[PDB]
Ligand binder design. Structure first.
Ligand SMILES: CSCCC/N=C/c1c(COP(=O)(O)O)cnc(C)c1O
Ligand SMILES: CSCCC/N=C/c1c(COP(=O)(O)O)cnc(C)c1O
Lengths: 523, 518
């Protein structure tokens, strides 16, 4: 099989007490560059854009600055070397793209609020679930200028949800429907397990079945029917509800049908008094009663780590296909802050409470970054009031990366909407091309590759090749059990993500190597 | 200031001329501010890190997963990351190499946020360890599972945030809820036994903490810890090694010496913990853990304190006797037990790379030991490496920044950097008091011995904005809004030299608020 090339050797990097001379330092940095350069040119297995030569030329000049966007993006604060003016421009652009109300205005509850992340979307998902936990549990909101389960939120998300949510749930102590089901409602699961036929609580909301009848070969989209049954169960018990929906899922690149979910859940929320409800937020200032305000009892979060970066552009083309000269083959669901639905008796309800996106995914960046966005009306009173930063502590991070706003600003400034439509068009068409070539390879060589692509996704999955090929092309791997609870049914998959830095020549080079790979051939 | 109009991003994009004009405006703004920043604990001169490392900006580097495991995302710098972690492990007297089979060996990782991530991780780790959640895979008492957090009034706001995020209760919350009338401390202002909101810091000339050094009151800590330990609670203590406003160093060694006998008396050195019930008959599955966790928030100080203590150990060899003693604080701090065994006292340390070293963005280190590692929240296929960190994707450019920094300086050069900063902080304090005598104004200058920050009366807004002076208000008698005083501080980082201080002092001497001072 192929050569992935040398790894870095730890001996070259050991840092002695006396320091390293300039020659040893440069040799080491050159080894890093040679390694990273070879790997970045061949990476096709992760949802991370690899080409930003232009941003490097333009933004290298900023590396001498210790930039810190400490505090809320909407006030400078005392740390003057900051890029909050740039950060606000990037936030504004995405607020427009996601049909949020702009400008940000602390006096307008419907207006957007958001900030740029210093980790990746893990930060945005953690923040979302923190914000939701406190909002749904009755903690105090930010300053303007009988039911025992009312304060016990329950989280719902599909089996294709990223591991950051399992992490966030544990960090924040938000209980999933699975945990609450087992603890409080052990024999009352409303779903029958398709393998066993028993009413056992599933660990996550089922995703849609594939040809097998099971989720492993399905599209990776949440089963809306299953979600609605589960949400109804807990809403009827009096619990407020947190739902995460994946817009570009980690392995399959699937898009949960956010509009279908919202249409199906709104009447459930209305029936069970979760559209508008009174909430006690601590005891009353002196005498032993409570205070009360009015809140919704549900929170829909869209994990658009990947997909919030391209879905607006695909949807633009879908709305005017002759203008963009492209009809996307798959429909991507309405998902953003513009999604508004009628009710029986509360008027139009704006359905989505928050969105996360990663900048190092579709746009590309040299480090993790991204955006969390919500609305003013959801903002929680900050944990404390630090004088020393001069700006409110409204964010998950303390010190914040102020170079990432420059990265994304530079990116966004170089492309029109039409250019952004072209980038998602080419990726969609090249993903379809890859799937076609993989099935043609199965016919030419008489090998099984198990190729699969969810319509509208920018990723294609297929049988895992040799370890050396996986290492050369940074293929991401996932094992599946074709029948849950049986380790004899394991299949090993990889996938390829067709990002804007992946072109036809790169895919053709990979395909030529797959065709001669010893695992692929010697099956 | 920067004009928002220059930065609005149109649907159609910006042309190359508008783009460059905007980027030039940003550079001009940042350059002017960087050169005058003296009010925050952030090194502003990286002395060629940018020359050396700009070349890496074309790479989407991702150190996804554990630093000590291969993963599938091959454009990563984990080899570099491990070199950096190894350097700090040695500096902090941790056991190396990292080895999952050696419980005493270090484990740590590089942060993608700043020290906020490391403080959050430490409290998460401690919460789960002290509460009996399952530990990582190697190759009676109703309060036993209810940890209680303690830290001083000079603790950074990231802890208040972390406590809220993680649902860890502070001694104040638990005191109020469970033990409302049993506070063992008397309030120095009121004389009532009201639970204070944080562990008292040491008093100043006022008899109150506001003009004190900013170090935790070890007596008060010990009284509080004993109270909750005696009730059966396990205990988390955060100690500040270079506090945010006063740059104080909690006496970590004194704290550990005072707490160990308390832990031994109340069975917190080695205790049985229930971490489940057995798969058939639900009998408690059990291992032995400690019932306390001491974290050092070295966001700032973990970067310089080793080097000062190196000089203190050999002052004639380094040609410098530090004037203040910085406490032993690290993984090497080991105390005798009642039975003449030894206990390694500190469980974790956090440090920020954008503070003492300098970086273009927030970064840092969290470090603990293998014996404390918690079982990951889930098992992910698609990353390869275990999900053992707070971040998911991780900044792999920061390891390059710190490696490059550390590679350029010997231990002796690092000792010189902290020497120069200590001497310049002492100079600043002398010049401020000389200014009070020359101009006949009261500047309230204050510097905790051994700190690299000096606090003084807040000057005009204009000067504050020019020099990025950090501000803090204090009430000189807690609860009385008429006793408010506004301070600023200057942090003498390695990028602050005599000339910069002298220029600031010349402006302060003509400042309207300083000259107009009642
Ligand atoms: C940049 S490629 C390696 C990361 C893969 N996925 C991350 C990922 C994440 C967490 O984002 P981060 O790693 O913290 O930037 C969240 N949600 C979804 C749907 C994802 O797919
Ligand atoms: C870099 S100067 C602005 C940050 C000031 N203080 C941060 C700070 C932090 C939180 O670190 P970060 O902001 O997340 O990097 C924690 N602990 C202590 C003792 C601190 O002083």
């Amino acid at each position: 099989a192929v050569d992935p090339g040398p790894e870095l050797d730890g001996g070259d990097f050991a840092l002695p007490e006396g320091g390293l001379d300039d020659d040893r330092r440069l040799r080491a940095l050159d080894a890093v560059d040679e390694y990273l350069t070879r790997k970045r040119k061949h990476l096709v297995g992760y949802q991370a854009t690899q080409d930003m030569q232009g941003t490097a030329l333009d933004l290298a000049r900023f590396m001498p600055n210790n930039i810190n966007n400490l505090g809320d993006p909407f006030q400078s604060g005392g740390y003057k070397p900051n890029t909050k003016v740039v950060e606000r421009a990037v936030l504004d652009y995405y607020a427009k793209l996601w049909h949020a109300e702009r400008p940000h205005d602390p006096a307008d509850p419907e207006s957007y609020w958001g900030y740029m992340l210093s980790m990746g979307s893990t930060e945005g998902n953690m923040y979302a679930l923190w914000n939701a936990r406190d909002y749904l549990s009755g903690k105090a909101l930010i300053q303007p200028p009988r039911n025992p389960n009312a304060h016990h939120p329950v989280a719902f998300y599909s089996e294709d949800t990223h591991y950051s949510f399992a992490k966030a749930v544990a960090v924040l102590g938000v209980e999933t429907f699975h945990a609450v089901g087992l603890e409080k409602y052990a024999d009352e699961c409303p779903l029958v397990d398709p393998v066993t036929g028993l009413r056992t609580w599933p660990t996550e909301v089922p995703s849609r079945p594939g040809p097998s009848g099971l989720s492993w070969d399905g599209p990776g989209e949440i089963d809306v029917d299953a979600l609605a049954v589960l949400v109804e169960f807990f809403a009827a018990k009096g619990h407020p509800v947190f739902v995460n929906l994946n817009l570009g899922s980690t392995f399959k690149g699937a898009h949960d049908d956010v509009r279908a979910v919202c249409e199906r859940l709104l009447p459930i929320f209305e029936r069970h008094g979760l559209v508008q409800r009174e909430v006690v937020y601590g005891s009353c200032p002196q005498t032993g009663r409570p205070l009360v305000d009015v809140r919704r009892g549900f929170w829909i979060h869209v994990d658009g780590a990947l997909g919030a970066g391209y879905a607006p552009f695909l949807r633009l083309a879908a709305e005017d296909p002759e203008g963009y000269g492209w009809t996307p083959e798959a429909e991507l669901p309405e998902f953003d802050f513009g999604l508004r639905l009628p009710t029986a008796g509360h008027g139009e309800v704006d359905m989505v409470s928050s969105i996360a996106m990663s900048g190092h995914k579709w746009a590309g960046a040299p480090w993790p970054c991204g955006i969390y966005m919500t609305k003013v009306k959801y903002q929680i009173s900050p944990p404390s009031q630090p004088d020393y930063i001069g700006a409110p502590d409204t964010t998950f991070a303390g010190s914040r990366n102020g170079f990432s706003p420059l990265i994304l600003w530079d990116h966004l400034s170089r492309y029109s909407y039409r250019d952004q439509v072209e980038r998602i068009r080419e990726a969609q068409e090249l993903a379809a091309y890859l799937e076609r070539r993989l099935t043609a390879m199965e016919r030419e060589l008489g090998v099984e590759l198990w190729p699969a692509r969810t319509p509208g996704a920018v990723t294609v999955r297929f049988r895992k090749p040799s370890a050396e090929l996986v290492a050369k092309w940074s293929l991401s791997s996932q094992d599946v059990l074709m029948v849950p609870g049986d380790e004899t049914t394991r299949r090993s998959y990889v996938h390829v993500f067709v990002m804007p830095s992946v072109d036809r020549a790169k895919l053709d080079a990979l395909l030529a190597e797959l065709a001669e790979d010893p695992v692929i051939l010697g099956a």
